[PDB]
Ligand binder design. Structure first.
Ligand SMILES: Nc1ncnc2c1ncn2[C@@H]1O[C@H](COP(=O)(O)OP(=O)(O)O)[C@@H](O)[C@H]1O
Ligand SMILES: Nc1ncnc2c1ncn2[C@@H]1O[C@H](COP(=O)(O)OP(=O)(O)O)[C@@H](O)[C@H]1O
Ligand SMILES: Nc1ncnc2c1ncn2[C@@H]1O[C@H](COP(=O)(O)OP(=O)(O)O)[C@@H](O)[C@H]1O
Ligand SMILES: [Mg+2]
Ligand SMILES: [Mg+2]
Ligand SMILES: [Mg+2]
Lengths: 139, 52, 535, 532, 528
């Protein structure tokens, strides 16, 4: 009744064409708010209901950094313009959008003028959609 | 009066004084009348009916 | 009388003119004016208890449960969740007073409420509202002329800040920071005077950074002739204090350069790979050496940087801070006297700023670090660092300091002052009453009502201070008439004298003129409305 | 502020709402005015159908929830009760008065001034009608009554057949004339019984030279025709005698039970024999008759009718000279019936009228009575014929009582409008405007008459006004006062010459009532409607 | 009627025909006119309309009120349309058109109820309107001197008359002077886009100013902007349409290199492209740089280093006004920045106005544009001030086109009514009634003026009628003295075209409404 989806592509039955390496970490369980794959496929960013953004490595499988500081759970997050040290935004239920940097593991910038759920970087990277538009060069 | 900061008891006594003075004024303005005068009675009745 | 018109035609067939006309409402004529006056009176009577030194704060709670304890009229009305349109007009009037002047945002609402309250009894006697508005305009012109007449001028020199300090103290007297009253006035005056164009030109509030942080005591609030940055040295092993620092402001991330255009670099051989690796290493070393060659002692970047640059900066005794915001970069460049350099190749010694001391500041058991840049040569930027025991008093101190800064800015624009405490309003009411006697009888009622409405401010001050309003106001007015002294006002603080000049209760003339003007215009606009068509 | 649990309307809103309601009521019945008016058909949401032209009937059947419209409806009802004719005209005049008065008020004229002007205009209109626009019926004769009846029956289902129906109405009205004290000839209409029975055409409607009962004989054994009738009118039932509530029969010796039971019916037998011993032939009773007394009457060859309506019995007794007897008890304490208490008639029959039967008391003595049997095509036609016939009877009664008639066809309204428009210039400064608007409002009647005929209303009314202006200006052209509207040709015509008459009381009472209603409604300027 | 097993039209179609629907149409027109009845005259009152979203619009303009009203009656929409037409063609008199049309229909309603053929009424309206327009053109006062002082005074008086009905009527002389100055300094086409209207919250009405140049709000400055000087004494302005920031050379551009030296060369080439654009701009001698496209932080700092001023993302209209005032040319390329394409102003300055920063270009001697900066206490206050100023500006433009004025205050209409009654008294009589009704309807405006002012309309109307009958063309309602006066001598002036268009539109609307006999309303589709 409520599910009607238990038979989902979980089977992933193919002829072993090199795509079977889906990893599917799912160690932290809880809620996978955003399983976005980094432009560099080395790393995975995941957000949970506790409000902490988690960075995982596909090869080792270990939790690199847990990004905490959001007031509420992070509903959405994005990636860097191309790689740029993966300076990623994180939009949650706390009406606040902030940027994190693994080279330091800190909230480099923050914005509060709006829950944000449709973050998207500008192609240049100087701004990002805040479904508004926040300018990196002017904060 | 109250907004000016006057207790609503000075107002009552002052209104009583004003009412007594006004009763005196109205009594002074009044004129004697006797029921033998039909014209005054007719005028009073007409004045009462003027607004209906 | 309500919902509009409803006939359905005299022939029975449907008679529908306006979409959803059965779901809409309509108020017309005098009862619409009475409803508007009643709503405005309610708003003004709510606000009038927060007027003067003995005013009481309002505790505002928004939709998210956050609490804002405040005394500012504009803030209170902005956070007030109203649905009546006239209440929205009151809110906009307060916002207008805040934007134009910055002080007196509560007096305008009380004045408008008093004016509409008097206009109510004027309307009950069969006077056209346009006549009331015209009389109010005439009386407002008279009152403004009288304010210009009785105004006094003060010196706005930097070698004598006593009148400025007194004006700021008068502005701050009604706020919660009256415990630190003189210190607050001092720092506000110094902040405005430091960042201002002396030829009576504007004061750029973007050059005043108001920063708040919990902890400490409210008395710890200080003015810093530099920039207070919410960052810290990037490497944990960098020294926490640099003296006589030669500052290099940079907007280029300390990373290998990257073209903006879509670019692909092809590695086609082992030699290409080795060349690329050497190019990376050499670019890192070269950028660090270029920074070092200028003689700089400290580097500030805007876009952060990576591990190799961090360790190279640490290795060369070059303290650095990363991810400094754009406005903070601008403030640091202004204060230190150094230019902003977009890339290392353009960095020279003459573009370096100077700071007498750069320090990292801890805040108790909180792990938070905040950078301080100060002791600049001729800094043209200031920062007000506000401490406190809870966030709420910090926000209130922020807006109170903003009020003080706005008042000193107004003094910079025009150096004419009028003594407050209700003295200005009482003298204006006297002048209006005197000019109403010569007026023809018909506008006399409107002018007398305007004078009575002007009388509300001293009465509100009297009742807030516990004194009897009517008796105190009458005695003060009689004293003002008896002896030529338009400075006699309400002794709100019970100092024992009614003369506001010795009490140094000083208000800017521009503020009072704006108050009267805005109140009169809004009252006229409300009086001109005679129809409401809400859905 | 008020905190009244209800809705409130004040000022121009309520005034315009009242005007709209009155205008709607007027527009409902405006299409049923004058000879070229057309009837309406009302369906009563259970299939009942009422076809009528009478304004009062239309306004009573309609269910109305706006109180000003209710005021106009009761105005029509009052005009019907006090006059019987002009029920539509009074409503239309009142509504037009309200419209023009509200226009004056919207022009910032105070309603008190409008009311004073309306009062003055109504008084002057009545005075002018009584002084200039009345025609005495002494110099006309029976032709005046015939013409008044014909004019009344125009705009009715019997309009074309006036040549016959007016004769019938006049004969019926004159047949019930009685003179009271003070020598005032009064005509008691509603004493003419109107019986409806479908069947033959309208020409076969009969005027009975006597009285018609909607009743039949109680027993088939009785004769259905008696030549020299001796009518006995009774008001008590002829049944087996039953003792009253306070009397109870208790038997101790059984020998008396048979005597008791026999006397229970012997009492009524003795009463019947006492009544019959005087030569009575026809016995009418308001109460019932059981089978025993019916057989008693059968054996004597006497007609007996039961459940006779009280009003019918009273009319029969008055016409025939009989006396109602609620009981048989003289002043000597005995129980007797004397022959002096008997009415007489020249014939009593039971005729057949379209598969049904009714009793005709033909040619009663000591007073002449009348009844009308209306033959139509179905029930609705007969009902409308009865309503129109009642209107005609009332008009003839008014004409015979007050011997003044006024020309019809809009002549009176045109003359009044001209006179009041001239006269307003000599009165007040704003009541002048009120009287002018009263005069203009008086013109709605000829306008509606012309419009109903699809004629050029503007030009026809203008020509009428020109004729009446010439009549009122030239002292030697006063014969033009009678120029009204001839709707058949759409041209002005001397209605007094053409025989379009109608009672003066109709116009006078309609004007007074319309002025009262307009003043009453115009006084309101605020409405509070509490939630039920 | 009968079910008619297969019905002709779609189910739910509403039909109405005959006299009753015409009467209902007239009543609906009356209802619409009542909505703007009290907004007319110096004693007129504003109306407040709230939309579904909750925003409140406060206005005295008849066209605005009618537009905000969501009218769905087919016959009533004609009055809204004619109000829009009067606003478009003239700019003032949008209440007069509706009042006149409704009064025409009301006056002819009694005749319609009597069954008069609508074609006769239409012909009577057409004849009366033609006569009235000819009379207006004939008796309108014009001065054939082309005197500058007289022309300026006439424009000022017309502006004051157009302004003495709004909330800014207290400062009507001030705003009339401003409007006349702006229109006169407009060059040849009187384009409304060449008059900027800036609304800034806070400050008295008298604080509003007219800039002899161009002014616009500060536009999202980048870092390093506060180091640029904010005042110049003879700047040269470079009006550009150029994106001055580092970016991809082109959207489809794609760089392919296989050598690190080529990588560094490409990076330095991008930087050199930006710096070449900046150097070309700087060497032109300009001191103020204005662009329609974003100006980056690098360019901002570059200009700050040279004591230059930059402002990117300027709205296009503001650049057009700056071009028309300072007198340069908007350049999409900087390769030829000669002295011809550079603007020039006497003084440039950035100043604070009520919590906002504005850029001022003053001292332009040959400016063909203006910039109104309006102060007030609320958003709707500035909005209604702008609406009133727009009315005045349109009146002044029309008066510039032709200086044919007629005295207002109902004087022109009383004269027209007298003339039409005199004409109607000399015709057969079927048209006489209708032309007389038209003449009587022309009395609605002075009557509405008296009603709004609280007068006794009947006495004033009688006095006006007697005065016009015995002579005196320009006698109208004197609102202040509650009497009548020679409104031409009181400078209550109106351009004749205002009344001409008002009468024309009202007559056309009345004729169209009367001509309709049947209304058919199809059922809604996709009610959802
Ligand atoms: N020490 C004082 N003595 C008497 N009156 C004062 C004193 N300080 C302030 N006031 C008066 O209190 C009034 C209210 O000031 P405040 O509440 O600070 O701002 P706002 O004018 O916005 O209400 C001012 O009009 C001022 O004249
Ligand atoms: N033959 C006729 N020619 C012209 N007018 C007539 C004629 N008969 C009646 N009228 C007029 O028609 C008007 C309407 O009468 P009607 O409406 O039928 O009576 P009521 O008002 O009682 O219903 C009367 O005022 C009368 O004057
Ligand atoms: N000073 C004045 N005295 C008398 N009437 C005036 C005056 N100024 C304008 N009017 C009248 O106001 C009428 C128009 O009202 P207004 O609201 O200003 O314009 P609109 O017609 O667009 O509503 C004009 O007919 C004019 O006669
Ligand atoms: Mg203050
Ligand atoms: Mg009749
Ligand atoms: Mg206008």
């Amino acid at each position: 009744l409520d599910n009607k989806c238990s038979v989902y592509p979980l089977t992933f039955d193919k002829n072993e064409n090199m795509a079977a390496k889906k990893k599917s970490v799912a160690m932290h369980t809880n809620y996978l708010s955003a399983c976005s794959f980094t432009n560099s496929d080395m790393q995975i960013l995941t957000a949970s209901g506790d409000g902490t953004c988690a960075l995982w490595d596909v090869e080792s499988g270990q939790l690199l950094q847990s990004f905490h500081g959001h007031g509420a759970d992070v509903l959405c997050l994005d990636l860097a313009p191309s790689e740029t040290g993966n300076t990623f935004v994180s939009g949650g239920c706390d009406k606040k959008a902030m940027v994190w940097d693994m080279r330091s593991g800190q909230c480099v910038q923050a914005f509060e003028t709006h829950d944000i759920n449709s973050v998207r970087y500008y192609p240049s990277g100087d701004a990002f959609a805040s479904g508004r538009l926040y300018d990196l060069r002017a904060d | 009066l109250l907004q000016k900061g006057i207790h609503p008891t000075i107002i009552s006594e002052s209104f009583q004084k004003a009412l007594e003075k006004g009763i005196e004024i109205l009594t002074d303005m009044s004129r004697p009348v006797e029921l033998s005068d039909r014209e005054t009675l007719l005028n009073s009745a007409t004045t009462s009916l003027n607004s209906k | 009388a309500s919902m509009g018109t409803l006939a359905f035609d005299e022939y029975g067939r449907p008679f529908l003119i306006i979409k959803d006309q059965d779901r809409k409402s309509r108020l017309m004529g005098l009862e619409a004016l009475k409803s508007h006056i009643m709503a405005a009176k309610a708003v003004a009577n709510t606000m009038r208890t927060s007027l003067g030194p003995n005013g009481l704060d309002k505790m505002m709670v928004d939709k998210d449960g956050d609490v804002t304890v405040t005394n500012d009229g504009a803030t209170i009305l902005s956070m007030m969740d109203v649905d009546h349109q006239i209440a929205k007009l009151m809110v906009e009037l307060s916002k207008s007073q805040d934007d134009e002047i910055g002080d007196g945002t509560t007096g305008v609402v009380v004045l408008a409420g008093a004016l509409l309250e008097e206009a109510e009894q004027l309307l009950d006697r069969g006077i056209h509202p346009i006549r009331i508005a015209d009389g109010y305009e005439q009386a407002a012109r008279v009152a403004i002329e009288h304010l210009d007449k009785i105004s006094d001028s003060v010196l706005v020199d930097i070698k004598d800040t006593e009148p400025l300090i007194q004006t700021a103290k008068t502005t701050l007297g009604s706020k919660v920071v009256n415990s630190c009253h003189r210190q607050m006035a001092e720092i506000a005056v110094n902040a405005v005077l430091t960042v201002a164009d002396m030829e009576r030109r504007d004061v750029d509030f973007e050059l005043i950074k108001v920063e708040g942080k919990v902890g400490g005591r409210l008395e710890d609030t200080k003015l810093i002739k530099g920039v207070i940055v919410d960052k810290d040295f990037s490497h944990p092993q960098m020294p926490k204090k640099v003296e006589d620092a030669k500052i290099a402001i940079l907007t280029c991330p300390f990373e290998p350069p990257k073209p903006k255009t879509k670019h692909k670099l092809d590695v086609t051989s082992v030699e290409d790979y080795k060349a690329l690796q050497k190019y990376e290493k050499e670019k890192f070393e070269e950028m660090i050496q270029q920074i070092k060659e200028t003689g700089a002692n400290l580097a500030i970047c805007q876009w952060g940087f990576d591990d190799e640059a961090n360790h190279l900066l640490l290795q060369n005794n070059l303290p650095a801070v990363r991810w400094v915001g754009g406005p903070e970069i601008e403030l640091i460049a202004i204060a230190t006297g150094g230019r902003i350099v977009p890339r290392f190749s353009e960095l020279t010694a003459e573009k370096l700023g100077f700071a007498g001391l750069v320090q990292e500041i801890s805040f108790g058991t909180t792990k938070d670090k905040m950078l301080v840049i100060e002791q600049c040569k001729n800094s043209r930027a200031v920062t007000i660092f506000i401490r406190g025991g809870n966030k709420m008093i910090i926000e209130e101190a922020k807006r109170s300091l903003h009020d003080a800064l706005c008042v000193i800015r107004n003094l910079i624009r025009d150096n004419r002052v009028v003594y407050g405490g209700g003295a200005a309003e009482i003298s204006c009411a006297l002048a209006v009453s005197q000019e109403a006697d010569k007026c023809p009888t018909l506008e006399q009622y409107a002018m007398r009502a305007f004078a009575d409405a002007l009388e509300v401010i001293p009465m509100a001050l009297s009742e807030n201070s516990g004194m009897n309003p009517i008796q105190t106001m009458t005695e003060v007015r009689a004293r003002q008439v008896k002896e030529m002294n338009p400075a006699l006002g309400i002794d709100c603080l019970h100092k024992g004298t009614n003369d506001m000049k010795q009490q140094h209760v000083i208000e800017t003339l521009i503020g009072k003129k704006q108050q009267i003007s805005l109140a009169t215009q809004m009252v006229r606009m409300i009086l001109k409305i005679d129809d409401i068509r809400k859905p | 502020p008020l905190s009244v649990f209800g809705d409130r309307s004040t000022g121009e809103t309520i005034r315009s709402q009242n005007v709209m309601a009155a205008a709607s009521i007027a527009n409902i019945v405006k299409s049923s005015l004058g000879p070229v008016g057309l009837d309406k058909m009302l369906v009563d949401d259970i299939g009942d159908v009422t076809i009528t032209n009478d304004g009062a009937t239309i306004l009573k059947l309609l269910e109305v929830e706006h109180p000003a419209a209710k005021v106009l409806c009761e105005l029509a009802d009052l005009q019907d009760k006090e006059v019987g004719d002009g029920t539509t005209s009074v409503v239309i005049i009142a509504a037009e008065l309200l419209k023009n008065a509200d226009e004056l008020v919207k022009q910032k004229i105070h309603p008190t001034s409008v009311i004073s002007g309306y009062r003055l205009a109504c008084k002057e209109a009545v005075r002018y009608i009584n002084e200039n626009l009345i025609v005495n019926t002494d110099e006309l004769g029976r032709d005046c009554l015939i013409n008044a009846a014909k004019t009344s029956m125009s705009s009715k289902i019997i309009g074309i057949n006036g040549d016959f129906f007016a004769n019938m109405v006049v004969d019926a009205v004159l047949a019930i004339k009685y003179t009271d004290i003070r020598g005032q000839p009064r005509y008691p209409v509603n004493s003419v019984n109107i019986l409806k029975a479908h069947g033959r055409s309208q020409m076969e409607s009969m005027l009975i030279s006597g009285y018609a009962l909607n009743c039949v004989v109680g027993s088939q054994g009785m004769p259905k025709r008696i030549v020299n009738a001796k009518i006995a009118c009774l008001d008590f039932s002829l049944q087996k005698t039953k003792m009253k509530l306070g009397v109870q029969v208790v038997i101790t010796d059984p020998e008396k039970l048979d005597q008791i039971r026999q006397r229970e019916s012997d009492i009524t037998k003795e009463r019947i024999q006492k009544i019959l011993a005087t030569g009575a032939n026809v016995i009418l009773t308001t109460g019932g008759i059981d089978d025993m007394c019916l057989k008693y009457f059968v054996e004597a060859g006497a007609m007996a009718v039961r459940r006779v309506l009280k009003r019918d019995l009273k009319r029969i007794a008055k016409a025939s000279g009989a006396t109602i007897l609620s009981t048989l008890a003289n002043l000597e304490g005995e129980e007797t019936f004397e022959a002096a208490m008997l009415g007489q008639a020249e014939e009593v029959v039971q005729e057949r009228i379209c598969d049904d039967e009714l009793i005709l008391i033909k040619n009663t003595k000591a007073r002449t009575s009348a009844s009308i049997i209306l033959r139509g095509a179905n029930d609705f036609m007969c009902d409308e014929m009865e309503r129109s016939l009642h209107d005609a009877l009332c008009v003839v009664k008014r004409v015979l009582e007050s011997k003044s008639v006024v020309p019809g066809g809009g002549a009176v309204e045109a003359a009044l409008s001209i006179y009041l428009e001239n006269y307003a210039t000599s009165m007040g400064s704003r009541e002048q405007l009120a009287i002018a608007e009263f005069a203009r409002s008086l013109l709605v009647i000829p306008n509606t008459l012309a419009v109903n005929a699809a004629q050029d209303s503007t030009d026809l009314v203008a020509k009428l006004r020109a004729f009446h202006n010439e009549a009122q200006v030239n002292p030697e052209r006063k014969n033009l006062k009678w120029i009204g509207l001839d709707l058949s040709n759409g041209k002005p015509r001397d209605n007094k010459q053409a025989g379009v008459f109608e009672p003066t009381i109709v116009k006078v009472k309609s004007l007074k009532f319309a002025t009262e209603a307009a003043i009453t409604i115009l006084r309101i300027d605020d409405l509070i409607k509490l939630h039920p | 009627m009968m079910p008619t097993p297969v019905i002709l039209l779609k189910e739910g179609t509403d039909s109405s025909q005959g006299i009753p629907q015409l009467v209902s149409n007239i009543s609906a027109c009356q209802v619409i006119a009542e909505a703007v009845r009290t907004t007319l005259g110096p004693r007129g009152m504003d109306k407040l309309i709230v939309d579904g979203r909750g925003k409140a619009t406060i206005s005295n303009d008849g066209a605005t009120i009618l537009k905000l009203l969501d009218v769905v009656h087919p016959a009533a929409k004609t009055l809204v349309d004619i109000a829009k037409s009067q606003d478009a063609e003239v700019g003032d008199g949008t209440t007069s058109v509706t009042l006149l049309a409704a009064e025409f229909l009301k006056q002819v309603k009694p005749y319609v109820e009597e069954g008069l053929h609508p074609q006769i009424i239409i012909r009577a309206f057409r004849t009366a309107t033609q006569l009235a327009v000819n009379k207006i053109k004939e008796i309108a006062v014009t001065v054939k001197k082309a005197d500058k002082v007289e022309q300026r005074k006439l424009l000022e008086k017309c502006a004051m008359t157009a302004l003495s009905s709004k909330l800014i009527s207290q400062q009507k002389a001030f705003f009339a002077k401003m409007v006349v100055d702006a229109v006169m300094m407009l060059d040849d086409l009187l384009q409304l886009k060449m008059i900027g209207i800036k609304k800034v919250q806070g400050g008295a009405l008298e604080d509003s100013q007219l800039v002899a140049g161009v002014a616009f709000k500060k536009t999202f400055s980048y870092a390093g902007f506060e180091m640029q000087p904010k005042k110049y004494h003879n700047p040269k302005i470079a009006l550009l349409n150029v994106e001055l920031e580092l970016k991809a050379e082109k959207d489809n551009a794609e760089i392919r290199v296989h050598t690190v030296e080529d990588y560094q060369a490409i990076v330095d080439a991008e930087w050199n492209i930006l710096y070449d654009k900046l150097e070309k701009i700087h060497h032109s001698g300009a001191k103020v740089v204005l662009s329609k496209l974003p100006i980056g932080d690098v360019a901002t700092q570059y200009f700050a280093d040279r004591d230059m001023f930059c402002a990117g993302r300027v709205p296009e209209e503001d650049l057009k006004r700056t071009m028309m005032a300072c007198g340069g040319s908007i350049q999409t390329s900087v390769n030829a920045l000669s002295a011809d394409v550079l603007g020039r102003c006497q003084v440039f300055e950035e100043t604070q106005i009520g919590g906002e920063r504005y850029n001022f270009f003053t001292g332009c001697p040959k400016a063909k544009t203006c910039t109104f900066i309006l102060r007030g206490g609320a958003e709707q206050f500035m909005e209604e001030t702008e609406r009133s100023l727009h009315d005045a500006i349109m009146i002044v433009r029309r008066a510039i086109k032709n200086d044919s004025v007629v005295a207002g205050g109902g004087a022109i209409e009383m004269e027209l009514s007298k003339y039409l009654r005199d004409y109607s008294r000399t015709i057969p009589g079927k048209q006489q009634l209708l032309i007389g009704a038209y003449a009587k309807a022309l009395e609605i405006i002075p009557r509405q003026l008296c009603d709004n002012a609280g007068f006794d309309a009947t006495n004033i109307l009688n006095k006006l009628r007697a005065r016009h009958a015995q002579g005196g063309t320009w006698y109208g309602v004197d609102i202040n003295n509650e009497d009548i006066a020679d409104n031409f001598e009181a400078f209550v002036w109106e351009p004749a075209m205002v009344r001409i268009n008002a009468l024309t539109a009202a007559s056309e609307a009345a004729c169209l409404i009367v001509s309709v006999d049947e209304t058919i309303k199809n059922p809604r589709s996709t009610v959802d």
